[PDB]
């Protein structure tokens, strides 16, 4: 009956805890603890290449990111196992974060590069390997596209980490090409 596996569940708990902390302590204070290394002296605090994905600055995006995390990530963990979801998550957070700060610096956050990796991965893995038992529904492809399109044309009030989203998508596509050559 329960849809979310342990990894799916633990990532949602972490995001909520961080989000609470950003209300109590404020956004900037948490960014300093968790953002991508913003100084050379912090290049070995290894959590920071991943913990940027846990911070949200707006209610609307924590909602939608956790929604597709819960749905897509939940599907990957249930059909492909926990470790597989873990790997997609870590690599996508790493590389999306890399491409983002390269062209825009380190002050970004959100779990959406990981989400876009999951979209791409679920999708292409279903397209190229239907036996796997995962598939990106058409309704979702549309919702995803509109959301992306909104981000890229700035239809939210916010500043968007587009590099990280497109990077994220790319990673998930690549991983699914590899995985689907069995």
């Amino acid at each position: 009956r329960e849809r979310a596996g342990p990894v799916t569940w633990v990532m949602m708990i972490a995001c909520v805890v961080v989000f609470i902390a950003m209300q109590i302590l404020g956004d900037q204070e948490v960014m300093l603890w968790l953002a991508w290394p913003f100084d050379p002296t912090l290049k070995f605090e290894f959590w920071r290449y991943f913990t940027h994905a846990l911070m949200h600055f707006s209610l609307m995006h924590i909602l939608f990111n956790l929604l597709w995390w819960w749905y897509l990530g939940g599907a990957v963990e249930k059909r492909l196992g926990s470790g597989k979801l873990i790997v997609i998550t870590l690599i996508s957070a790493l590389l999306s974060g890399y491409v983002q700060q390269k062209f825009s610096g380190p002050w970004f956050g959100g779990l959406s590069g990981v989400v876009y990796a999951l979209m791409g991965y679920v999708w292409l893995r279903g397209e190229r390997d239907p036996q796997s038992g995962i598939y990106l529904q058409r309704g979702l492809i549309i919702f995803a596209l509109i959301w992306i399109v909104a981000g890229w044309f700035d239809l939210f009030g916010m500043s968007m980490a587009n590099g990280a989203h497109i990077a994220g998508l790319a990673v998930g596509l690549a991983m699914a090409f590899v995985d689907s050559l069995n």
Binding site: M31, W107, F108, G109, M160, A161, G168
Partner: peptide, 4 residues
């Protein structure tokens, strides 16, 4: 901050 920029969101992803």
């Amino acid at each position: 901050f920029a969101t992803a």
